Amino acid sequence: AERDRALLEVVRGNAASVMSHGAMRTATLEAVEPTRAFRDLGFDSLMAVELRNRIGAATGLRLAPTLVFDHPTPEAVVRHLRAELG
């Protein structure tokens, strides 16, 4: 049951990493809402695909490239990974 908190850390950790390329890498995860849309955190198409690749490598699953737009929040992404894993 608590596995959703561990799955959220995989999503949050990799989202923070995609946001941390370049000059500003003073980003943190714990404070932002799990129901915050990735579009609101400044995610463009390349950032969305990079986040799919990072989550896919961490979980070992072949996710669709539109993952971030199909599941718009870290919360919605967690229940999609939970469905694909078990």
Partner: protein, 893 residues
């Protein structure tokens, strides 16, 4: 006349001298590995043991089924018993990473730990030599091992076949050659306690005769049963307290030890040529026999003097040139006086009294490691020479009164002594004698002292392992190793990690040009956490590579600018493209890319298409320079001209001519039309545009839900209003021409003229045509082909499905910015393939950081990269930790 005769003699004399010197060429020790009693798992661990003066003798192991309690009896004549209670052991002798070497858990249990210890030690020794053990596959690398059968099999179900080869003494050497695909001879030597030193002598001779380019020389001893203690204590050859008191008055026997000790050797001239770090040189070596001694098991002082004088002659040295001897020094009342006498006669007479030969023995710390003892002693002396200290020899209460110590200048190392580097090189002898009478003596010499690199920005730091847990331990061990280092050059570390270590399945790369970013990223990799500069992935076992050459959309003001200054290869390919375009164009490619005053910008079709052609060709050539050779190439519209050139169908002049003149042919159609991307599948996009007939065309089909439409200004404006009404997403492409529409019929003659005189050749890399959707013969890319390319639909999705259907799993878009990557990811999704897509540069990221991020990402997926082309041929060698073996206990009960 006599000048020619004298000149011939001067040449022949020099050739005779250098041929004779080559027959006694010094042999470089370039790597070492060992596991010895007292926690030793490395040459530095062994150094710490002798520098601290530690005694590693301890109680018998309690996890080997031995009757440790019942086997003790002080009476030497008690049958099956031993008066020895302590000895030198590898209490982790059964720990082995079976999976790493593709050995099943059941084969590992029935496998003799001597073979297992030799496999990990051999891997580590090649790594410490700066040699990627996998790059030794197919090389003339010899394996010379001293070892004996020690009765490990005194067996699990379905592994008796494995137990046969798993316990054959010959396979202790042979399995190394098999596992690493080494092609030189693998010999197992048995000359009892001199085995590994005889093995080193043979490896040296094999190298001197040109039989080998490199060789492994070593030995191994594991005592799975307590037999050596019960048998030799009956002969009263063992010390009751378990200590080998080398050359002491209190000496009362020797004692057994377990161990593995290996060296990687190579001719000194080859180490210097290959840029390997020389740890020490085996200058002279010799082996002989006791002959007619006072008994088969008895040592002979005259034979020991003769083997020392043979080793000195082989080295071209005299006794006074040697500062110390790492003696055989078993601690027996019989052997010790005889060895000291031979040392006093062979070494102690033609030298200053105030510079005596200093004598010690590693057996005083860990015991007698039998076959492995000789090479263990050379590791000790190599570390002594590198640390500049001659360590103490333990348990010397008094020098043995059985020796006339006043008869020669030979002194025992009762306390450590500094070994000065000034004046001449440090030199030491190493001895190993055996019960069968075969003696060995080797003369080591200090590494010669006769042995400016600018950095490469954002040099990738590569790490890999056979499992994710092993990759975390790789990162953790590297992080610890770098903390115990003041200021290591990051490019030197990057070069060592990429050129001296094996690329395993689970991969990671740290790409950054900032300070203080790599350390934290290693700790994140070590703990399983992500990091911005940390790229991770599993290498695809199999997969063919495709270079994708898009058409419109990848340009940016500034593309190529940074690379022109920081990459002399890219600048050279751009210079070739410029020479090729000059005859067909009024502007300068370099001036256009730099945005020089008076030069045209990408707002003109006749300058952006030939500039994009030059960038894509130069980026493809740059990927090939870095070792990435594609198995296929695919192009979109004008992009096919760059793809056909990289495929070998078009020469650079012919391809420059087509792109320059065909884009100039488009100019009369400016303003008469455009192109718009619809988020619709091909069939629905076609249904949507039927009302406009010939005024609209399906210009391209790039993905399952991505169609581009082209046509007249009027029909596109009407289509856009229809899109607004129906809710079909449409984005106008910022072009002033309707390519792939009926409008290009009005310029057909001028477009056919663009390719006049071209001589299309067959391809050396298959060209998957987006005009036909299949591979095409290079000889078919004539003028009508280039008109059809511009007039008709770009079948990019269909051609992508043909590439996926023929085993293509890596797609590299060789562009200034990725424009067909989303469409590729979309078709790959629909097909259900395990394919990968990576770009080269992004808009505003045309530097080496981005290029190296792309190269590292591709490597991470399994693309082979020539890291020498990326990081430079040679750097100052940086020693790294050895493989983080993930061991488990495998012991027959």
């Amino acid at each position: 006349y006599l000048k020619r005769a004298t000149a011939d003699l001067s040449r022949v004399r020099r050739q005779l001298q250098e041929t004779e010197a080559a027959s006694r060429e010094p042999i470089a020790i370039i790597g070492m590995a060992c596991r010895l009693p007292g926690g030793v798992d490395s040459p530095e661990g062994l150094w710490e043991l002798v520098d601290s003066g530690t005694d590693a003798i301890a109680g018998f192991p309690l996890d080997r089924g031995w009757d440790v309690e019942g086997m003790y009896d002080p009476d030497a004549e008690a049958p099956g018993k031993t008066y020895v209670k302590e000895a030198g052991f590898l209490y982790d002798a059964g720990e082995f990473d079976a999976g790493f070497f593709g050995i099943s858990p059941r084969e590992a249990v029935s496998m003799d730990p001597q073979q297992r210890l030799m496999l990990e030690a051999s891997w580590e020794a090649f790594e410490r030599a700066g040699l990627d053990p996998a790059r030794q596959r197919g090389t003339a690398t010899g394996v010379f091992v001293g070892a004996t059968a020690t009765g490990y099999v005194s067996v699990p179900e379905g592994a008796e076949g494995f137990a046969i080869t798993g316990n054959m003494t010959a396979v202790t050497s042979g399995r190394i050659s098999y596992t690493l695909g080494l092609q030189g001879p693998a010999v197992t030597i048995d000359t009892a306690c001199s085995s590994s030193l005889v093995a080193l002598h043979l490896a040296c001779q094999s190298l001197r005769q040109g039989e080998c380019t490199t060789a492994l020389a070593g030995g191994v001893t594991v005592m799975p049963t307590p037999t050596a203690f019960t048998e030799f204590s009956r002969q009263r050859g063992l010390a009751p307290d378990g200590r080998c008191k080398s050359f002491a008055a209190a000496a009362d026997g020797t004692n057994w030890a377990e161990g593995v000790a290996v060296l990687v050797v190579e001719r000194l001239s080859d180490a210097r040529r290959n840029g390997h770090r020389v740890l020490a040189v085996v200058r002279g070596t010799a082996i002989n026999q006791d002959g007619a001694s006072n008994g088969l098991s008895a040592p002979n002082d005259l034979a020991q003097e003769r083997v020392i004088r043979s080793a000195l002659d082989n080295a071209g040295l005299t006794a006074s040139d040697v500062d110390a001897v790492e003696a055989h020094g078993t601690g027996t009342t019989l052997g010790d006086p005889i060895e000291a006498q031979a040392l006093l006669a062979a070494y102690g007479h033609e030298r200053p009294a105030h510079r005596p030969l200093r004598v010690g023995s590693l057996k005083s710390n860990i015991g007698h490691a039998g076959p492995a003892a000789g090479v263990a002693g050379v590791i000790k002396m190599v570390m002594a020479m590198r640390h500049g200290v001659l360590p103490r020899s333990l348990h010397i209460d008094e020098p043995t009164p059985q020796v006339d110590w006043s008869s020669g200048a030979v002194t025992l190392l009762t306390e450590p002594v500094d070994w000065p580097d000034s004046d001449r090189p440090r030199r030491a002898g190493v001895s190993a004698f055996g019960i069968s009478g075969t003696n060995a003596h080797v003369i080591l010499e200090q590494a010669p002292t006769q042995d400016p690199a600018p950095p490469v920005p954002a040099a990738p730091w590569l790490l890999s392992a056979k499992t994710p847990a092993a990759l975390r331990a790789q990162a953790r061990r590297l992080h610890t190793h770098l903390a115990r280092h003041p200021h290591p050059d990051p490019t030197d570390i990057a070069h060592a990690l990429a050129t001296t270590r094996t690329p395993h399945e689970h991969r990671a790369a740290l790409v950054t040009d900032d300070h203080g970013t790599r350390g934290p990223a290693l700790a994140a990799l070590a703990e399983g956490a992500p990091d911005a500069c940390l790229i991770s992935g599993t290498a695809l076992s199999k997969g063919r590579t495709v270079f994708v050459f898009p058409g419109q959309g990848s340009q940016w003001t500034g593309m190529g600018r940074e690379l022109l200054h920081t990459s002399p290869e890219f600048a050279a390919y751009i210079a070739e493209c410029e020479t090729a375009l000059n005859d067909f164009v009024d502007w300068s490619l370099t001036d256009v890319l730099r945005g020089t005053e008076g030069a045209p910008g990408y707002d003109r079709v006749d300058v952006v298409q030939p500039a994009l052609f030059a960038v894509m060709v130069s980026l493809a050539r740059l990927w090939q320079h870095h070792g990435i050779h594609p198995d296929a190439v695919i192009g979109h519209s004008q992009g096919e001209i760059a793809a056909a050139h990289i495929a070998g169908a078009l020469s650079l002049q012919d391809a420059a001519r087509i792109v320059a003149l065909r884009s100039q042919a488009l100019l009369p159609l400016a303003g008469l039309g455009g192109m718009t991307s619809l988020a619709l599948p091909h069939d629905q996009a076609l249904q949507l545009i039927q009302p406009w007939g010939q005024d609209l065309s399906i210009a391209s089909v790039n993905g399952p839900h991505s169609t581009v439409v082209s046509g007249t200004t009027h029909a596109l404006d009407e289509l856009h209003t229809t899109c607004d009404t129906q809710g079909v997403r449409a984005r106008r492409i910022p072009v002033d021409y309707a390519s792939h529409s009926a409008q290009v019929e009005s310029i057909r003659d001028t477009v056919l003229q663009a390719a006049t005189g071209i001589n299309p050749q067959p391809t050396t890399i298959p060209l998957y045509s987006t005009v036909t959707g299949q591979p095409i013969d290079g000889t078919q890319l004539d003028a009508d082909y280039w008109y059809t390319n511009l007039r008709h639909t770009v079948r990019f999705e269909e051609t992508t499905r043909a590439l996926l259907g023929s085993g293509h799993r890596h797609f590299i878009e060789t562009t200034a910015h990725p424009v067909l990557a989303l469409a590729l990811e979309e078709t790959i999704e629909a097909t259900g393939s395990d394919a990968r897509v990576t770009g080269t540069l992004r808009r505003d990221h045309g530097d080496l950081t981005q290029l190296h991020t792309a190269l590292a990402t591709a490597w991470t997926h399994g693309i082979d990269v020539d890291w020498t082309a990326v990081l430079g041929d040679r750097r100052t060698p940086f020693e790294l930790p050895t493989y983080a073996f993930q061991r488990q206990r495998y012991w027959l009960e």
